[PDB]
From a paper:
The wbm locus contains three neighbouring SDR genes (wbmF, wbmG and wbmH), all of which have been annotated as nucleotide-sugar epimerases/dehydratases. WbmF, WbmG and WbmH are all homologous to Pfam01370 (NAD-dependent epimerase/dehydratase family). The abrogation or reduction of O-antigen expression as a result of wbmF, wbmG or wbmH mutations implicates all three genes in the biosynthesis of this molecule, and is consistent with the hypothesis that these three adjacent SDR genes catalyse the UDP-d-ManNAc3NAcA to UDP-l-GalNAc3NAcA conversion, which is probably required for O-antigen synthesis.
Author numbering:
A (entry chain B): -6 to 244, 248 to 306
B (entry chain A): -1 to 308
Amino acid sequence: LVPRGSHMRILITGGAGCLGSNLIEHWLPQGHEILVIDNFATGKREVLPPVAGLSVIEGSVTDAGLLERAFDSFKPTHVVHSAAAYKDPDDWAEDAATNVQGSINVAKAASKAGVKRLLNFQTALCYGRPATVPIPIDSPTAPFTSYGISKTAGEAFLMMSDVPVVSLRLANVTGPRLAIGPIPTFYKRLKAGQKCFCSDTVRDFLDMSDFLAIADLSLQEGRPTGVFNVSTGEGHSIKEVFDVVLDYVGAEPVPVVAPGADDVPSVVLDPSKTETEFGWKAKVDFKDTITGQLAWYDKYGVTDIFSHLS
Amino acid sequence: SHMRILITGGAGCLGSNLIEHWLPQGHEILVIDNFATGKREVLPPVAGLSVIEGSVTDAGLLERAFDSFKPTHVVHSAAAYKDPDDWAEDAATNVQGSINVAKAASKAGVKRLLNFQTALCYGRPATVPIPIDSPTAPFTSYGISKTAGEAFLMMSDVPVVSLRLANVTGPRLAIGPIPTFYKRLKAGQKCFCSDTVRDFLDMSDFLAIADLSLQEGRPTGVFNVSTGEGHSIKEVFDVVLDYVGATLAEPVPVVAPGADDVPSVVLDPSKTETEFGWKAKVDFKDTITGQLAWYDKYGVTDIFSHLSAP
Ligand SMILES: NC(=O)c1ccc[n+]([C@@H]2O[C@H](COP(=O)([O-])OP(=O)(O)OC[C@H]3O[C@@H](n4cnc5c(N)ncnc54)[C@H](O)[C@@H]3O)[C@@H](O)[C@H]2O)c1
Ligand SMILES: NC(=O)c1ccc[n+]([C@@H]2O[C@H](COP(=O)([O-])OP(=O)(O)OC[C@H]3O[C@@H](n4cnc5c(N)ncnc54)[C@H](O)[C@@H]3O)[C@@H](O)[C@H]2O)c1
Ligand SMILES: [Mg+2]
């Protein structure tokens, strides 16, 4: 039915996570039909209320029969692959099963089911220690952690698919229900009057609204396929983030501390090919990105369970 | 210098040739193999040799093998590759299998783990001969899963050597251009050579570096194993023609390489020479000729054992 001429039946793996739930909140009010598959390893049941147009299967992308049955009953036109394992750096076996084998399973099931477009999200950890920052899209993959090695292979399998695939390599995305990293940490700590420390690292940040716009473009028939960096292309230090929080919240000068052994000095993506090929560009700058995150904390707390669905 | 060696994939070409080299020296050897491609004939019931039939994907089986056998050394030679559409098997054997082998070896406190890597990990190289610090950029099921496998092994606390190998020739090689030209030329069938360049390594040179790799105090990490010289498939053909003594009814056509066929894959072994002091001794003509001489004696067979069975 609606939206007229472009109703999607969207199968979203990992739909109970941050990105998944934010996409559901974006698409469901438009009339799209959504099916989520999640094992609740990190995602939350509370972000998936029993509303019309939304179904939820508690299961794993590693379970290939659960997937064939779900693709067969639901008949999606589109797939968003957002399921990932990462929480235990030493559980290589779970990373490989979810991130490699689960990607392969989704790919095979999508191809059989005839889906029009498949959207995957890739961690910038795929680049490992880059030689060039901002990282060009044609830079090699060079992961050196369980999460990066497994995601790298996952993406590589997906790119062999006969289904048109977009894999978005992502900046640190901010928005509703983000509850980890420097933004919430500096916010809670500064309100608690606790000592903060800034890693001596450059990172990039993307506002949820800009993430949503490229996700929309990525699922349109006829649009480009392949791997794409999604960023403003600007990098900001952890200290710069801290400074925005401090001023926002209104509290000895903060020490610049690290970086840890496995911490890459600078990770900032070059989005130039994505601008060219999609005509997309990130509209929300750094200050507004962090500020809107902090504004969300003021209203709902540092929580990962506040649903904007009725 | 007595070794208790656990060899996964020991029924295959490299594994079985290793066993023939090491078992006469008094080493105790356990093989784990699922016989996907390796043959039961190459592993006779002799003193010093144990065979468990099973998969590196089976974490339970592996734990029980490492516990009972207590290896001092591990040679990880198991790989899946035969069906390029069977991504799930490639990922299970090559990624999960490598992870199970790494974890089990770590737990059992092995002195040294030896891995073999396909040059498909390099994808389409930017520089030939391929430097050892070149990126991994695989684009096939076999190259992707093996790349991930090796990367997981490199995260082990056990000392690891991973050898990126030229095309190894020796007893029981029954695939590739060498046996194909030998058989076809003797039968009067038309041959064609792809216009590609490759490297070839005699078994004797392979045994030498494998030996060095298993010795305490030796270097660790990734290494290219090669003469460092490349030869076209036409050059291989030419050696086979002359050796077989055939007369051609038309010149061999040299044809443009396939879609997925990398034009030139030759490895630069300099770091291996620097750190190991190893250098490949057998030149191209002698390497090809030694393969053809083996076929003259035994035929193109992968079931002839050089071990003396009771
Ligand atoms: N949020 C970011 O800024 C960011 C940056 C780079 C890449 N990514 C990628 O985007 C995707 C979503 O990230 P997120 O930030 O929303 O994280 P998230 O932890 O909130 O993950 C999404 C979900 O995956 C689920 N999951 C894990 N294993 C599963 C399994 N085997 N079967 C089904 N579901 C499973 C979790 O329960 C979770 O809800 C991931 O692939 C991640 O690697 C995110
Ligand atoms: N021979 C070469 O020139 C060459 C070149 C580069 C890399 N390598 C690497 O060297 C290693 C051995 O190669 P090969 O030429 O001997 O090939 P091979 O096919 O003869 O041997 C691989 C062996 O692994 C076994 N196997 C497959 N899946 C298994 C599983 N799940 N559990 C246990 N065993 C399993 C097969 O039965 C087979 O005996 C492989 O890792 C390969 O990728 C070989
Ligand atoms: Mg092989």
